[PDB]
Amino acid sequence: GAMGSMERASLIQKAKLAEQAERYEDMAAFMKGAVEKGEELSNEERCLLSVAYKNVVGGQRAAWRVLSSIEQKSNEEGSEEKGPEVREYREKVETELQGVCDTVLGLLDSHLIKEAGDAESRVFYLKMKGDYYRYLAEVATGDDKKRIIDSARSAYQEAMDISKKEMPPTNPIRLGLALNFSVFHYEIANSPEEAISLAKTTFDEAMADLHTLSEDSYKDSTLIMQLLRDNLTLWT
Amino acid sequence: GAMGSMERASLIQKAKLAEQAERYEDMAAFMKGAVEKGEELSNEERCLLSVAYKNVVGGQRAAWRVLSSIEQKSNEEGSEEKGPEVREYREKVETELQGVCDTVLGLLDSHLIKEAGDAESRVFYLKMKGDYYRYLAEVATGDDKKRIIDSARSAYQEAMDISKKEMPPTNPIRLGLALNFSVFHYEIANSPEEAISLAKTTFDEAMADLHTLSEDSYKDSTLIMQLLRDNLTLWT
Amino acid sequence: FPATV
Amino acid sequence: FPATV
Ligand SMILES: *SCCN[C@@H](O)C(C)(c1ccccc1)c1ccccc1
Ligand SMILES: *SCCN[C@@H](O)C(C)(c1ccccc1)c1ccccc1
Ligand SMILES: [Mg+2]
Ligand SMILES: [Mg+2]
Ligand SMILES: [Mg+2]
Ligand SMILES: [Mg+2]
Ligand SMILES: [Mg+2]
Ligand SMILES: [Mg+2]
């Protein structure tokens, strides 16, 4: 790996500099190098890892959707044949996206998840595993599409089971997991009713636990509760 | 070159798709491949080339300024020593920026400028040459800094001489050249009075020529005139 | 699109 | 920063 010669602390420092400069590809490469040092990640370092790759793949997904929309329009009735170029370029972006997802899933599998024993870290990584299988599912069309969808479901489900046993209902990692698993149900698994039920039940159970929280914890939890409410409003 | 096997028309088509997807690195690579086919560029293709690289280097300059600011703060009195990391990462981004500028200047030199005979194309390319030497000048600190600055000046000056002889004072390429050369005077050459004089004289001479223009040409010209006025307001 | 974190 | 095109 190109980052093998750099100190772990220097990679963490440069990941933070890249975030400040909005250089998320650099940020992800630095955090990939940090993970490959083999030590477990701190809470802050987990956020650096997730922020970097969320921004990288987020840009790829946005571009893929633009190109996929153009491609679908070119395949409509009455459209002039433009050649293979739109499909080729959509495929290029799709392949790069899949490469990033495979990279993240590889870091989780070798060996972040198996060494994560605390509920907070294990749920965080399993949520990430569900997320990046979900991104693969968004572009999947082949023989393994159902297996990709079930890999996302399985990761999300294990994270949910741990989070319900080991974390309070206002825990922001538990809330963000539920938010994303709900979106998985709605957009990937064609289960809008399960999506709505999960978002509402997550919101209500967090609402009843807010009284236990400090002002700062309250702000964290209510911010994600608002995202659950936003989705429920979009879906109902 | 990685694009040598793709049709010129397909590269142009994919450059436009990349622009729609805001994938400017892809857009620049496609347009680099198109230029290296060896044929001259059309008016529209020149815009594809300039838009792609302007966005790529614009992002690098923004990141370089963030990192340079952090570096200067770390070198102030009372600042804690953080190690070489900030300088290293600023140097990394700086080196990538210089590589892009060298790439663009290489395309202009081999062989866009020497084949550009019409005033519109020749001024366009010479303005680009001034622009990318200006970007090199922004990060230059070594023995060749004055030579980089003079390379920018020389390119801008040849473009100005042609544009004053061969284009009307409302021509948008002539106006954009004057806008950027004025910024060169202000920010690079430490000549704010020349910057202000050029912006004002360019604005006034365009104003007096607007009566000759169609509605659509009027919109093009007045849009860039407003940018000249914006800079004059910033500088006075 | 719906919100995810 | 000043405007350039
Ligand atoms: S780890 C990056 C910053 N954390 C936030 O994005 C967020 C919402 C979160 C929640 C679940 C998974 C990933 C990220 C968060 C976490 C903790 C406290 C507040 C917000
Ligand atoms: S070529 C990309 C689009 N052209 C505009 O950015 C702009 C302002 C221009 C002007 C000078 C150099 C480069 C770009 C322009 C050109 C022509 C008409 C209107 C605007
Ligand atoms: Mg070490
Ligand atoms: Mg594919
Ligand atoms: Mg249930
Ligand atoms: Mg051919
Ligand atoms: Mg240097
Ligand atoms: Mg003069």
For the secondary structure, the number of strands of chain C is 0
Overall form of chain C: rod-shaped
Largest sheet of chain C: none
Number of domains of chain A: 1
Helix content, binned percent of chain A: over 70%
Pair with the biggest interface: A-B, 23 and 23 residues
Structural class per helix/strand content of chain A?
A: mainly alpha
Specify the number of helices of chain A. Answer: 9
- How many strand elements of chain A? 0
The quaternary organization reads as heterotetramer
The proportion of strand residues of chain C reads under 5%
The top-level CATH class of chain A is Mainly Alpha
Fill in the CATH topology of chain A.
Delta-Endotoxin, domain 1
What's the Cα radius of gyration of chain A? 19 Å
Describe the structure.
Chains A, B: The record marks 61, 134 as: Interaction with phosphoserine on interacting protein. Chains A, B: The modification Phosphoserine is found at residues 10, 79. Chains A, B: It is found in: Cytoplasm; Nucleus; Secreted. The complex is a heterotetramer, with 2 copies of chain A (236 residues) and 2 copies of chain C (5 residues). By secondary structure, chain A is mainly α. Chain A has helices at 8-20, 24-35, 43-74, 85-115, 119-139, 145-166, 172-187, 192-207, 215-235. In chain A, helix 2 packs across helix 3, helix 3 (43-74) packs parallel to helix 5 (119-139) and helix 4 runs antiparallel to helix 5 (119-139). The radius of gyration of chain A is 19 Å and the shape is globular. By secondary structure, chain C is low in regular secondary structure. Chain C has no helix or strand. The radius of gyration of chain C is 5 Å and the shape is rod-shaped. Chain A binds chain B through residues 10, 13-14, 17-18, 20-23, 26, 62-63, 66-67, 70, 82-83, 85-86, 88-89, 92-93, and chain B through 10, 13-14, 17-18, 20-23, 26, 62-63, 66-67, 70, 82-83, 85-86, 88-89, 92-93. Residues 47, 50-51, 172-173, 176, 220, 224 of chain A line the site of one (1~{S})-2,2-diphenyl-1-(2-sulfanylethylamino)propan-1-ol (G8T).
